[PDB]
């Protein structure tokens, strides 16, 4: 299928603005990520995601840009159909490898948030840099198959696309199978992290509620003259301490309440004997011990939960804008070409497949680190 004919009134309006927006978003994303480089395991993966979009844009886009001079965009620019052989291989490579890069981002949050053991397990930050050659290596092996004899490339109707053609050869079905499985895999990791984050919010809420129970009842002991009110306030504090207590920080958190409950038992011991003033004296020492160990864990809990949920928002917007664009290609590949006499889903799948790589760097440009409004809305 070689569609040489093209209306003379073709203007390079859509191509130029798309290439400009893509390169500008990639450069802005690289410049803003370089500010952190002087940076986390999740951020270093975003650097390779915009780098893959920038590397692909510099190879895929300029091919159709220079060929806009003639009426026929690109029939055969170089012998042996080298023009499409370079265009089709580039779009096929930078589409599966880019989706594999999203899987590495989703798998990172899945291992870190989902499994506490994998977080304690050392994952070298420099190892994240080695992911990019591995992702390109796996994608290169799968994308090398259509380069053989059974692989076929035909020119689409606009004359600038020559992506994989549906035929008797079973490769377009396998290529969409990997993309479909990756979408489900990335969504499965996101759904797991969301469930883990929601469970993390309830644990922090219960921990904060027990923290308020300790502080509120502590003020009652200071103004409680009768020993009955002192024993009643210490009773709710002791139960709240056992509920809050339920890695180096984990061992210190348990030991923090183990000595804290003992101070409550000592204050309850003086309250039973009738020493109200001595019981209030132990209550003052209880505040110093609690702020030394327990308060430090609460501050880290609020900071860690806030930082990880921001990375999830960055991951959630990107996978949504990969899913809406990759679904037309999934339906197009699975459906037979002979089923539709005048196939129109093919051209639509080509558009979204290129748009998603352009939107991804702009997503990070809109979602700045001040996402506190999006975190709690």
């Amino acid at each position, epitope marked *: 299928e070689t569609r040489q004919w093209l209306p003379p009134g073709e203007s390079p309006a859509i191509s130029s603005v798309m290439f400009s927006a893509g390169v500008l978003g990639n450069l802005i994303a690289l410049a803003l990520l370089a500010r952190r480089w002087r940076l986390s395991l999740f951020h270093v993966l975003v650097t390779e995601l915009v780098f893959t979009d920038l590397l692909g844009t510099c190879l895929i886009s300029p091919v159709v840009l220079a060929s806009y001079a003639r009426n026929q965009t690109l029939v055969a620019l170089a012998p042996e159909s080298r023009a499409c052989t370079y265009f089709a291989f580039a779009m096929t490579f930078f589409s599966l490898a880019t989706m594999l890069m999203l899987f590495a981002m989703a798998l990172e949050r899945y291992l870190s948030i989902g499994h506490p053991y994998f977080y304690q397990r050392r994952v070298s930050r420099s190892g994240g840099l080695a992911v990019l050659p591995v992702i390109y290596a796996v994608s290169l092996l799968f994308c090398s198959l259509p380069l053989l004899d059974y692989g076929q490339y035909v020119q689409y109707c606009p004359g600038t696309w020559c992506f994989i053609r549906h035929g008797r050869t079973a490769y377009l079905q396998l290529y969409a199978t990997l993309l479909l499985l990756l979408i489900v895999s990335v969504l499965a990791c996101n759904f797991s992290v969301i469930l883990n984050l929601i469970r993390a919010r309830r644990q922090l809420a219960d921990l904060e509620d027990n923290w308020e129970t300790l502080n509120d009842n502590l003020k009652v002991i200071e103004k409680a003259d009768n020993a009955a009110q002192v024993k*009643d306030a210490l*009773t*709710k504090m*002791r*139960a*709240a*301490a*056992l*509920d809050a207590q*339920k890695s180096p920080e984990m061992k210190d958190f348990r030991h923090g309440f*183990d000595i804290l*409950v*003992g101070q409550i*038992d000592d204050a*309850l*011991k003086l309250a*039973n004997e009738g020493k109200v003033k001595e019981a209030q004296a132990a209550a003052e020492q209880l505040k110093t011990t609690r702020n030394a160990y327990i308060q430090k864990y609460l501050e880290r809990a609020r900071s860690t939960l806030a930082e990880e949920t921001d990375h999830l928002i960055l991951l959630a917007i990107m996978t949504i804008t990969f899913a809406v664009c990759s679904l037309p290609f999934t339906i197009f590949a699975y459906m037979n070409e002979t089923s539709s006499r005048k196939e129109k889903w093919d051209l639509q799948a080509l558009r979204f497949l290129s748009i998603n790589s352009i939107i991804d760097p702009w997503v990070f440009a809109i979602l700045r680190p001040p996402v506190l409004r999006l975190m709690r809305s």
Partner: antibody
Amino acid sequence: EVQLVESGGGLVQPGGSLRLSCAASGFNVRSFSIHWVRQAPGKGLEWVAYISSSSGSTSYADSVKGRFTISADTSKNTAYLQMNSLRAEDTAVYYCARWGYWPGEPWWKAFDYWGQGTLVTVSS
Amino acid sequence: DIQMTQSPSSLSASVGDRVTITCRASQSVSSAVAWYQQKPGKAPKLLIYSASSLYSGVPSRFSGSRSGTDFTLTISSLQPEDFATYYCQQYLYYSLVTFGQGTKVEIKR
């Protein structure tokens, strides 16, 4: 193994005094607090006394304050409870138990071993 | 002065049936709720401690669960050796120990 034997129960006239003894075997009383629970015939359980031989603190039920006196002897490794000015409602069964100190695993295992208990009947 | 209230007071079932007992605490207690089994003419025995773990020696048929301030004792399959009175106890403090009202399972016919 860990065993707790109670003794000293029986018939007591109202307004008198009785000395109950709880002997432990298999462990030391200085590492576990000793509790005395009472159960009335045709009713449930009711904690009536507690002592901690590690520090010497004692506690009783609000209904029995001022009439019971609990003590522990580490030389003999046992507990003695003296009951003065008994009433008609004291006809019950007394059980002896141990409770570990906080923190640790035996602390959450409250009353892991229960004694045989002895019967007390206060009737004139 | 927490007053433990046990709603199940009399339940009749046979072997193989599931039994559910509920214990209610007047005040919030984190995990200081234990279940004890007392046979007629015998000393009680601890079944479930901390409402999560199982005692070393008791059969695995008994299980414990927590929901808010309500504790649940679940027996999957009854046996002729499990027909005894059940008691709920709180052990939040050494001086704060209050038992429930009791629950004795019966054989239905």
